[PDB]
Amino acid sequence: EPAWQTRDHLDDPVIGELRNRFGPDAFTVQATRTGVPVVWIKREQLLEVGDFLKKLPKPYVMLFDLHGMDERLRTHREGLPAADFSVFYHLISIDRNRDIMLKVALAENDLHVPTFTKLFPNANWYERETWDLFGITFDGHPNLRRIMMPQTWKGHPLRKDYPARATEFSPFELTKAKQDLEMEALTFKPEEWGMKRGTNEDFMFLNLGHGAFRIVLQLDGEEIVDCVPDIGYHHRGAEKMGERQSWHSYIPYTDRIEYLGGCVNEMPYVLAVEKLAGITVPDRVNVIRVMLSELFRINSHLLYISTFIQDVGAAFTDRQKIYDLVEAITGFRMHPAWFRIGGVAHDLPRGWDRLLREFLDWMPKRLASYEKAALQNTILKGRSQGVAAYGAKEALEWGTTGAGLRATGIDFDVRKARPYSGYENFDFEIPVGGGVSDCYTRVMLKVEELRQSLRILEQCLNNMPEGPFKADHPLTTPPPKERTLQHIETLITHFLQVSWGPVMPANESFQMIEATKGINSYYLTSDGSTMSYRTRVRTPSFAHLQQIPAAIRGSLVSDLIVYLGSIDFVMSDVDR
Amino acid sequence: EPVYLPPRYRGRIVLTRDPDGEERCVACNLCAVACPVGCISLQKAETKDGRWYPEFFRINFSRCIFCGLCEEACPTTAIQLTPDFEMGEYKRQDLVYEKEDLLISGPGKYPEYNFYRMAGMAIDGKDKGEAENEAKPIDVKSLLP
Amino acid sequence: MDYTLMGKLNDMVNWGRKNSIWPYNFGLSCCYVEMVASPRQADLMVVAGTCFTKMAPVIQRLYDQMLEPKWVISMGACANSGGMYDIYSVVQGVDKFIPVDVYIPGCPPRPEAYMQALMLLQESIGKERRPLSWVVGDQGVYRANMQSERERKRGERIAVTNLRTPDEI
Amino acid sequence: ATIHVDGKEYEVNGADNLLEACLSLGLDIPYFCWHPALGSVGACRQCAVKQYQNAEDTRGRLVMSCMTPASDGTFISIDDEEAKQFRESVVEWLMTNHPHDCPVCEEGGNCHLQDMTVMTGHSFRRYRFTKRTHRNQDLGPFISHEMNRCIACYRCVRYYKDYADGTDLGVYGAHDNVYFGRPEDGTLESEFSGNLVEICPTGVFTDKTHSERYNRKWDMQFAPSICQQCSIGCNISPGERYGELRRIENRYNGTVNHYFLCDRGRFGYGYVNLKDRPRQPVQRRGDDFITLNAEQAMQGAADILRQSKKVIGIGSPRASVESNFALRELVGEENFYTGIAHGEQERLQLALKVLREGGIYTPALREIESYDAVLVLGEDVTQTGARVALAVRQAVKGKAREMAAAQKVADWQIAAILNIGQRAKHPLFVTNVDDTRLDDIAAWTYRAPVEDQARLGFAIAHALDNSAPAVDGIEPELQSKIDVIVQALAGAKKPLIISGTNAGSLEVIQAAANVAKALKGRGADVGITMIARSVNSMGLGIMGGGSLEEALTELETGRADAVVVLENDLHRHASAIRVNAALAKAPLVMVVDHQRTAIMENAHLVLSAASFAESDGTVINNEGRAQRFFQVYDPAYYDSKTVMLESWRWLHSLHSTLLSREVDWTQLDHVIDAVVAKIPELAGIKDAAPDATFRIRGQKLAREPHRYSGRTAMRANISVHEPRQPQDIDTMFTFSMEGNNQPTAHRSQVPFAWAPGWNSPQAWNKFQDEVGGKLRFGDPGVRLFETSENGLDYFTSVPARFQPQDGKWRIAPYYHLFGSDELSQRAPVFQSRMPQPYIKLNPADAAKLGVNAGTRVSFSYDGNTVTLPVEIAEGLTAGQVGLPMGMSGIAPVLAGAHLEDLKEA
Ligand code: SF4
């Protein structure tokens, strides 16, 4: 019974609880390769089901994801309710270490769902993105406006009838948008942003400028009364591109989401595609992927910590050494594009042991230097403690994952809770904080994660398995190159995989991983074709950016700047 | 100092030659379709002896993301990404590299592979039965059972 | 050489603009964090990242805030052409709305590619003709039609025969 | 019948085999030797499934699904482990000898062997020994041969020999050296040899014409179009790349031309890529040829047309219905002339009157295969309507099919059927001026002049029905053969009468109508087929107009001083001296054409019209079926200065500029609405294809596959800035990948067949309701007219017998599949295949002239002395001289004409 098998999860106790509560005919269980019980709920029972799951003895406390899907061109929907569109809700029980996906089927003429914001406040931005990209209205939403596209945008780009490729450039629309930027402040209505009490004659409205983004600030003097972060300035159409590229040729796009991560961003996508293909990778592939993911985690953590130290007023050679090793292994520093379906693009180069040994023997003195510069610095400690602090309740209700969630004391790491890529064969600790997640605790947790990633790299170096760097599956893409260049059937397989694409049988797969800034997940729907029917990417920085108004309510602008530096986020991760 | 680059480095793209000196590319168009950006364009041509080669071969380097998917897709190792990164230009039209800007005079990173030594299709210097692991063609009118 | 629309001091002015260049680096996307003054004081704009449609007006506005003479370097496939993002929300190239003087391929380019961009721009200013004052002389700029860097480097590039095999570091 | 595949219950047809039943249900079973059109033979052993004796059976047995009836209560498994292992083993055995050829193989990305290799999941070679090799043969200009890539699936020989009745392809040799080819090098002689390139699942037989300018199937931009090279209207998928027409694939139509084209349609597209085509409007002023853009061409043309007293228009059967109608609206109904001669127009409207007023059902091309007796009167069907000849061969094999059905042999078990029906066949009687290519299967062939062919038809009609007019002067031996024909036709349940306009004789069509009416009066299920000459001969006949002689008279008398010639060279329908003199007399000649013709020298204005690859329109079948063709590519995408518009667009904007002094580049649906409003007989062309607002769940139909490559590079040598995607306002297709080509989409127009896991022409299985049947949501195209309630009367104009008169030589028409049709004989690959210009003679007449075979004789027709070398024709009759119609200098209006001063040069 492999890990990629299609299961309906009828033995999950949440299915029996839902059956005993709402009756056996109130929902439809779908068998998937997501590893999660997927149930189809009536629209009229969605809030009741969400409230019931919120009040279980080990409750489902986190809205992990919420998005839509255009089901109109989907030809393999056997055992599925009739739908033109659908909305899915991914909910996580942390005490249970379980999750459930709820699906609401919608007809094309009635695209409205009850708002989920009364149960989970992060549903606000998730529903704004679903409205923006699919045109699905959420009744009761306070400010249901566009969040990726500008407000003067026609059409919903993630619909199947929307043309993906770039339209013709018009200078006149550019001058019109520049004009709209000219007196945006003069024609600023604080009703189009969800704000209130616009000019008491003491409230000031400003715009501001990890990526560049705007946030409108309502200030009473220097105190923040409300704020609305304006995002979507870095929207690259990555999911729509997932429908326009083959399963193989989408991998560089996985790189450029969360561009400080690289192979870390490759990992959930190729793991989900291997679930769709039914591929179990060999152990050497697992250790190679873990080693590259931990090298890039170290690189991203070092950049984040070095940026935080400089911003407060309390770094390049280490990242250069990591980039040199990654450049030797993959041929590229920043966007390696090196993981593959079934394995990795090449074997490890001869001499990788020497470079990794030189990196690991040179790092612990730098680790002591960073711990002295951060944990033992009083100016950093007095600047960073207590500013924008939240507890477990606020991290659970806002979908906060990564260092902030563990700083609240919730011991939730994906590598330990739901292991992937052979992470269960490594000995490493998960650092957690007290009950308070402020800037100092988050940065301290990132430093401890740096130490643990160095331990994982030491274990990767010490016993690196000998074996194949690609799986023996027929759907390993591409095949091994020497057999491609020598053998006719391997040439045939390579020819068809790199041109039309590999045929993934119709299914749905899911994979969440512990990325450098939180939990990154790929949710892939295959319609039996050589491209993805739906590529949904859940990124931590979207959810972390949504939590900003609920954490610096009543703080100062300098506190907001420190909070922005303390959040490990990048804007490409937010907007994707 | 010159910047050190590892042998796997994904920089400027070249087209290579087989050890006999003929150009390796057979214009099979696998690199172009494997390009996610779609910045390769080529056309198949054929010599009198039947050898496939590219009539033209152009790469839009203003578009190319140096991902190496074409070199991975090449079944003859003709197209190769090389450790060179100094490709800056004054005009964007000059970033379209034709075949005279790509075809170098050597085998590149794969020094000995000859796809035509593997192919059953006959060219000059290799008739039927002279490829690797190929028996000689038995004529259908042979006396042997 | 060809140009597209009393002599020693013109060369001195060109030299003064050549070895004194103040860049305004535009963040945009991953090209910036690879490659790492007010726009009124800066005279070179380096655009390094994707031209998203929501912030193409920002790029055009901060370009119009700069003063004469102004040069543009476009770093990376996104700023050059749109790159791999030929998608609904991306402008296909910086040069769709502002004129570009040097283009740098890569995704991202190396920092040394930026340094080579600086050299290419430096001789580009070094042999260009710009008016001395607003009242004396012809009030037109003359950019030099330089030989392409792929035409100049063609012989040494084609002469390459063997490279190191990819099984090593 | 009820079958259970992998425990899932399905309802199928019990008369089918399990392979076709399971492919129709959407299941995937790999297969090589089976084809929907050829039947099942059980050769390749690829299609193995596991059959169980009942539901409570676990052992099972590997059976061949193509050789197993899908009977009631069947239990099979496709996903059985032993069946999957065996299918992978069969692919492995085919892979042991297969050459390492995929990059340099024209079948790559379009290869069924690649697809079934991947589908079985075989990607690991454990065979380490040598591969057998083969020398290749030269099969002529169209088909390239690579015997290394063969898998010995026997599809080629079964198609070419048991289906198409070709004689020069076969299997040779033995155990594992089995060879598939000709007995020696030479051109493949079948008129339908080009279907090998889709029948062969590998790259053995490949399109040599495509191989010259090769590109892969993902790089092709396809559109659904209609073949323009004769009147049969076979659906095609033209595909282009880099602005030139690359390939013609068969487009499946279960009502017309299901899997097969003829060689003329498949390989005669090369005129589209000619470098002398007009690409811009060009005005002749003195000796100068000024190039104009579209707007000032319309302005100058409208000024000269406004200042002229009478403007006449000359259409063509090449042009679509929309172009001819737009010319008819520009010049008026009273000033519009069809471009064909008076005799051709008389024969065409007589055939139209027979088809839509004779009360006899005219069959579609696919339905021809089900008739029980065939009488072909005057039509060289293999050289003029070739796909009808292939359907006639299927109708002939119907007798063996019935004989095997009488012994309870299943209809897919083709080898048993052919063994039972050894040489028995349904009756075929062909009649021509000489021997035809249907004579191998014909029960009787009548070689006679067209008067005697008509008299034989009239005599058959009189012998069937005594109310039909009698024929006086029939010889006793010819009378005995007439009674043979009458006993065969009267004894058939479904007799079919084929005739057409190519014989050059009105009386032949009248005799065919008499035979069909006589059979209808006896209660038979008789069908009648009329083969027209050109792609839109029937549409031009339905629209109607004056003859070309009347237009030439209007030009010569000076009553018309402006002539607009649409897609017509005018030399195939009238004498070149008269046409040239009449056009030189007119002070304004405007030629709207996509080919460089001879009359463009006299033309004052030349409009660069679009051919079928660059235009949309509607053409009418020889059976009255209205079919839409769609534009394949925008000609201005690569060359920005090309002004190559649709002919209806040119003429509509010219009419707008003539009336209101403003141009109006209209839309196609507006022109079609104008047609159906103004000509009620052509009202059915609205339903041929849906309008440009048609969507599949909101999206358009994609012209190119989803993996289409080179988007930011194919034009980068012209400019690095990617141009705007060319907009299509005329049709529901988009010029990009951003559309729909799903097999389950509710549409009838499929630009190309592709499904995941099925990259070959076998992907047409996914687009059909059942394999080899109709398209899932109906075949495209609509019949314009229904069968009349009442028939015609008997034609009493029985001609006299042919009398050879001294000094005069009756011209007997000889049609060639390669050479007679104008546009295809302009194609450069046809020149090697084209016969040399040979004038045919009886041995008696040649001995009378003192002329041997090969000596050149000169004759004067219409004051033009031309010289051709002599071929001796045994089957011709004395007093007749045979000429190749449609060749260079021999206009098809010479059929039935007489010749003078035939003497040795
Ligand atoms: S490296 Fe990648 S983007 Fe560049 S030409 Fe090759 S496949 Fe295309």
Ligand code: SF4
């Ligand atoms: S993949 Fe290689 S051989 Fe094929 S067309 Fe491209 S460079 Fe040429």
Ligand code: SF4
């Ligand atoms: S060119 Fe590549 S590295 Fe640069 S901004 Fe674009 S995606 Fe990022």
Ligand code: SF4
């Ligand atoms: S016939 Fe098919 S499998 Fe054989 S070389 Fe050609 S593409 Fe490859």
Ligand code: SF4
């Ligand atoms: S030549 Fe083609 S059709 Fe004939 S047996 Fe071989 S693979 Fe089959």
Ligand code: SF4
């Ligand atoms: S029979 Fe006529 S319509 Fe059909 S393919 Fe041949 S030329 Fe074209």
Ligand code: FES
């Ligand atoms: S398809 Fe049935 S044995 Fe070949």
Ligand SMILES: [Ca+2]
């Ligand atoms: Ca059109």
